[PDB]
Amino acid sequence: DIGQGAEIIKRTQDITSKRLAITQNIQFDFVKDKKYNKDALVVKMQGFISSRTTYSDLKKYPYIKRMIWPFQYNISLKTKDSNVDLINYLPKNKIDSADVSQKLGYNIGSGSFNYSKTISYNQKNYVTEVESQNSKGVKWGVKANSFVTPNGQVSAYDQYLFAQDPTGPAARDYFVPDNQLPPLIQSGFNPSFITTLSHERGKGDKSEFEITYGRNMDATYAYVTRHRLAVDRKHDAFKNRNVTVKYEVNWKTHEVKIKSITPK
Amino acid sequence: DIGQGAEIIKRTQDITSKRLAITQNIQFDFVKDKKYNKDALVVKMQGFISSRTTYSDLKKYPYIKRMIWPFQYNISLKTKDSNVDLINYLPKNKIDSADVSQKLGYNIGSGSFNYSKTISYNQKNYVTEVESQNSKGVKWGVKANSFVTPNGQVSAYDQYLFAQDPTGPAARDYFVPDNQLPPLIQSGFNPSFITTLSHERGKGDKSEFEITYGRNMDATYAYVTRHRLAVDRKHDAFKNRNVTVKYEVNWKTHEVKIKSITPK
Amino acid sequence: DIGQGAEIIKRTQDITSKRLAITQNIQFDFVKDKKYNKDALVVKMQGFISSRTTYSDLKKYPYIKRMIWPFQYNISLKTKDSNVDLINYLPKNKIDSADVSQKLGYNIGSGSFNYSKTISYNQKNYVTEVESQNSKGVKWGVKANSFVTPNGQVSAYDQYLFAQDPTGPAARDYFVPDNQLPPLIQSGFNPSFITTLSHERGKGDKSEFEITYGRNMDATYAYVTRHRLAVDRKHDAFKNRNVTVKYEVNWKTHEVKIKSITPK
Amino acid sequence: VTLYKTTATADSDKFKISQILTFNFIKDKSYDKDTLVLKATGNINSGFVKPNPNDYDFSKLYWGAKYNVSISSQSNDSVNVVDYAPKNQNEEFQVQNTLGYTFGNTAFSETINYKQESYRTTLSRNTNYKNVGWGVEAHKIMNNGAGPYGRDSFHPTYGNELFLAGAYAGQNFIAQHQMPLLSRSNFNPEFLSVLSHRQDGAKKSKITVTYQREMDLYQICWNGFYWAGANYKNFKTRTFKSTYEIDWENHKVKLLDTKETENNK
Amino acid sequence: VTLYKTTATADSDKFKISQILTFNFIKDKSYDKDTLVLKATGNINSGFVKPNPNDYDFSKLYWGAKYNVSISSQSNDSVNVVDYAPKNQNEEFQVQNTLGYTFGNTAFSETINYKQESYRTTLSRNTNYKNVGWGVEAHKIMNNGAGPYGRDSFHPTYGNELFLAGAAYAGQNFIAQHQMPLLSRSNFNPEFLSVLSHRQDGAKKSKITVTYQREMDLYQICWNGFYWAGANYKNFKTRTFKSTYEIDWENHKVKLLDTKETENNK
Amino acid sequence: VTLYKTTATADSDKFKISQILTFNFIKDKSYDKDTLVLKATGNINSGFVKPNPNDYDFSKLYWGAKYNVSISSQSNDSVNVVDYAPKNQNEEFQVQNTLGYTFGNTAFSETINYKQESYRTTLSRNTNYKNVGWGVEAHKIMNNGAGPYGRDSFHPTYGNELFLAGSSAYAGQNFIAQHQMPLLSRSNFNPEFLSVLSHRQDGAKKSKITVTYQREMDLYQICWNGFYWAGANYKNFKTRTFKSTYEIDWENHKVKLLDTKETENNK
Amino acid sequence: VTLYKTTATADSDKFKISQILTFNFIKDKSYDKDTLVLKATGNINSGFVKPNPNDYDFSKLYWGAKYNVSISSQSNDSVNVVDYAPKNQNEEFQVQNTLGYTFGNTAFSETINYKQESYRTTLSRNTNYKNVGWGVEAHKIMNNGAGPYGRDSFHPTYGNELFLAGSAYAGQNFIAQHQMPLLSRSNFNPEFLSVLSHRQDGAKKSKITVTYQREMDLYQICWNGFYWAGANYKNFKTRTFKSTYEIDWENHKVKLLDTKETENNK
């Protein structure tokens, strides 16, 4: 119910993977809760994962135009220290809810009967799902869901997505312009995730955290034949394009060091 | 993110240009913020700019009736002191926003198809636009935008605006009554503008501010011929009908004097 | 802006006119506002004015049925003390406001054009109007306005109001039942009015207030002839059925006495 | 300002009527009189009587159609009733006038929006400087989609269709659950009154609290062609009168008198 | 910061006009001038005149069509009017554009949503550094469902249909009195605010001029044999109540000095 | 916790671009580094160019189609960009599915509700641990009821109808009215961006920050083929960039303008 | 009032089930007993099993159709479960009855407005003074516009259309995985609260039993030559993780003592 709010010691660490265009902005709040049994730490995970959305000509078949785009963003925190527990994390999965309106009616002028039903719900471009978690870590996947277009909403799992009648000879000309692409595709993703962790006292001072950011890219292919447009879709074209960073934490000295990063 | 609110010394100055029917109500809040590097001043700009809306017969052609009315109100603050910076100002330009509701449907009694789209936005009589600004000053233009009438909204750039079938022989009779004129035309404008300014210390005590209020008048001409009404419109008929007032500021003694006013 | 709230001395007086069925519940708050020039008094006027709605047979013509009912409630406060000013009072008259929604449309299946306008406003059974006021007093009239019925709203100034096809031989049977009568007619009126008054110091200690409560009764007549219902209406049948009470106020001793009441 | 609290209760197990009285004595230095805030709650049964299902040609039921409460001080005491709640409402409603035109017609409409309650509370006319009283009366009662009806609804042929369903007479009433709660179950009053007492007055005063129910007789009969109904108001009346002794000096209250009165027409 | 309050009143029983003036003197150490907050309330009758029901061919009534209030300081004093309320509103309204297609048909529409008031308050053009004034003018007046109308409504045949009931006796062919706007037939209860500044090296006493005024319009109708027609004549009668108050900036007192009741008739 | 404020300004009167920088130096005892909150405001003209009304067969205008702002630290300093605003929005919209039956008929429909803005703000891809940047790009532009349009709208016959009005007139008079254009396309952009930077205490007493305001101007043109008017938009045909370098004194909590660079690209 | 906090965790990596237990020990002087607030969170995988796309005539999948959590004290201890959240909801909905007449025509209608959730949380019937338990059960599941469906939906010909899509391979004629409810295919993240009381003259240490469980349903479809039909078999597989924790009411500590991973398969 009440746990846990008192004196804090904050530390920050920031780092970028040039190779992958991914930036981790990590904040470490050491929690000295005088009502609590153990050591506590709040890890706030922010940063930027570029969309790395690209448009190109196939090397073997330059007449075919390819758009590569992030279908999923990957976020995870793990540890190996047996003295460390994951005791809280946000976001969590929740049960979807919806509004329903249902109507029956009759007319007599003659006899007539009518029925209608309306479901009302809220939509996100990208849905954040907890894909796994246990006392030693948690992994989220932020998945493309539904997108707004003229003539209605469209599913991220529709294959003709983003394809268009070419407005030119270039690859980009084969796909919808930026003003029809959402921020997480046109630009990238700004992660905000939190984890609260405990540490057993008198059994060691240091622990190591593996924080991972990344993308799963889908690929949409388009080319012209017979005055009809050919569009095809390869899902999970490039999975787990991720960067992993190892942070070392000293629960006694309140010290945080970046131990490693792959890839650079 | 915030700055800067603490101890204040206030001074006021009020002045009118009989010639032009424009009144400046200026309030000067000298700010002593003990957390700040420099001297600071908040200038609160209020007052009254009469509409000076007039109805007349042309001297050369008394059978033609003219309505002169304010299309724009002009507000500006400038300074020449190299030691003075403009570090804040309100209002600022903003991105317009709108609500969209879009619907698709089908019927089978037979086959039928329907689509509808609704854009929903907020309108002002007059729009306030930052027309220019730099570290030494800022100038706003408050422009006639859109007006409410029977049978819908009308644009300020429509030429038949305000013209009507004459209800009499006088000039006024050729134009809509006061109850169809908005407050900024029927009466005038009540400016509310703010600027926060800094001052470098140890490089001089006095600075001079040029505050300008005024109007750009449009002219709508109407006359009767052949039992048909002839209406014409001159945009920017009388531009920059403005009064400029010079205030001198002493940042050390907290003294404010009126240096000049044109026209009187 | 700020005036006027600080230390209070309260006194109460309650009284009823058996003759007229009217009760005044009056509270006197002497205000010792150390920021104010003069003596101040807040008179809070509450109580109960019975509707005295009655149903009867005419003495000279028992076949005619009469319903007498309160069309207006009368409230007023006056004084003669030259040292006393009325400096505030509630309620005041206000400008009515309404919401307007106006629509234009076209169709082409062919040419068709449509227009609609909707005015939206709030209604009360009884409207409270300031009928007169000056530095020595104020008089309100609470007037019957509009009533909810089956098939829509009806005006208090409609003559066929409250009349119905007789459900019996009695007078009451000729008029709508209690459940179609609003509280101010079925039961009566619960006045809530406030007045703030000042008093000049060193020019006398005592002042006298005349508070008046009452009714203006309208009369609705109904009778049956030739299987058609005859209904007629006499407006202001019995005006100013009022009770006046004189209260004496001592601004020095904070004493309030009941001087008189008419009728008992 | 100083506050003293207390309570007092009075039951009529016979009539199923109960008075819960909650008292706040206030001593205010800026006031020349003693103040008493009195909240009156408890229970007043509707006295609803199930109809006999065996009744054939004519059948009847009683239902709680009005509830009356009153609080009084005595003519000879220094205690006046200065304030109370609820007070009579000047009812408000919302209007929408729409005018529309088409050419290539001329339709208009008006809509009103208002609240509808089965039972309505108004002040008693006998209210005066030493007595305040309220009446909770059956107001707008719906059969199914049919209605609203009241105690005096009258259809020229079918009479009062208040509880008429459409067989046996006693089985041609609407379902009991379909009736208003306050017509078949219990009324739970919640009334507030403020009384003032002169400090040079009696150390003790007497207050009279009255709870009452008016039971209406609703009956229906078969004429050979239709079922018709009729409502008779206040055919039965049950009244519970309590007199309480107020000790303004020690801030106590004590039940002194009880009177259970049964009127039957 | 220190605050001093006081009040002053002025009546015109003849014109049924009353001025209630509420004063807050403010002494602020962070300020080099004395501040006075002045709230101006009271009463201004509409001056409504019931029509004679016996009038047959042509009949007339007067109604309160505009109310004017002003607060002034004198040219020779150190007192300027620095702030006030209400100020002119830059009015806003809401728009809905709808486009619809069916397959064949093609509908489109636009809707505007706005407030409508019977009387509108705007600033006086003579407003300046020593004077602020407001005009409350008859604005959007509805007959029944008919309207809105104003002082200058003009239908080519029926003229100004403002208070015309049905186009009987002329004086009985006006709309019901209760159907008229409250401010046209009853009383205007002003509520205006002004802030004035006073130089401390100025006079110990100043003079303030408060003016309440009513413009009464003459509304008449006549029978031509075929229809009833109407006309409105603006400010046919004017009733003006001017008061002068002496302000003691030193002792924070106010005293009524002058009264002027002026009757203009066309 | 202790807070120190200051300001710094930089003007490009030629480009009509101005940088207002507002600084909060924060010293937090529960923190091992120095914190700097940097709010970046000011002005960036659209650089809008009125068309010549006399142009007959083909006419052109320039409009401000994108605004770019960036804040940077240097590779060799201990100053990292730890936080900023605004961040990318994962956009939300509301759905209503309706199914209806009558007896015979069978109707169904779906409605979506969402916000529409003329200019959209997204992050710069070059954003990293020492640099944050935003792009405000022309997004959803309405002609009248027609649209929405953007920089890359293409109708197979009428081309880009972004600012095309209709009419049988001069080309330079067949654009829409200036007032009908988006504010940020014809007037001034007033940026409002926030950044948080952290500084190692064992680092340099002084650091350097690079703030860049930029405008991308698009060339919109129309031409008459004898049958219709057609239009085309050319992106970033002109680019105006204002780069400022500020010296930060983490010790005395001062800021000082050091460099200015006004750069003009024209295609 | 004095508060002491602590935590305890328990994992079943095999079943992909995790218990996070958050503890608030309360000592209240106005109370004769020790209070313990226990929040039970963590993870319970659905155990969803992708169907084989190669299956031709008949195919099957498993999905998480119910989640069960319970918290218990032992019969022989002085520890009772006095309060908890969530409790069962007495559900509410809104009604609109409309009656309309035109003159001839006579329309009437009724509309109901209510909330719809894919999974519903209700209390366990075995709840008693020493045990509280919740069941999160698949409730209202929509295919596309089709539905809502549940574990026991039955169409006379097409059977249970819960996850049936539509001439293809059987294992390819299921709806897309993403189209399924999150809790049917992903992870359940419980969030349950309970309050327990402990007699002070009781044991210094007590034992609490926390159980997380999943009921996996077998959904299958088959081709009869004319249509595709489906069927759902409840709790065909059950995975249950039982943990026993030792509570030290004296020192406000908690220690995991027992773990039991149990697999039931039909």
From Swiss-Prot, chains A, B, C:
Per the record, the major location class is secreted
Report the GO molecular function annotations. toxin activity
**Does Cytoplasm appear among the keywords?**
no
Keywords, comma-separated and alphabetical: Cytolysis, Hemolysis, Secreted, Signal, Toxin, Virulence
Q: Which domain of life is it from?
A: Bacteria
Q: One of this protein's GO BP terms?
A: cytolysis in another organism
Gene3D superfamilies, per database record = Leukocidin/porin MspA
Q: Which InterPro entries does the UniProt record give? A: Bi-component_toxin_staph, Leukocidin/Hemolysin_toxin, Leukocidin/porin_MspA_sf
Subcellular localization is given as:
Secreted
Q: Which SUPFAM superfamilies match?
A: Leukocidin-like
Q: Does the keyword Protein biosynthesis apply?
A: no
The record's GO CC annotations read: extracellular region
One family from Pfam that matches here is Leukocidin
Q: Which family does it belong to?
A: Belongs to the aerolysin family.
Described by its record, this protein's role is as follows: Toxin that seems to act by forming pores in the membrane of the cell. Has a hemolytic and a leucotoxic activity.
The annotated subunit structure for this chain is: Toxicity requires sequential binding and synergistic association of a class S and a class F component which form heterooligomeric complexes. HlgA (class S) associates with HlgB (class F) thus forming an AB toxin in strains producing both gamma-hemolysins and leukocidins. HlgA and LukF-PV can also form a complex.
Tell me what this protein is called.
Answer: Gamma-hemolysin component A
Highest classification ranks of the organism: Bacteria, Bacillati, Bacillota, Bacilli, Bacillales
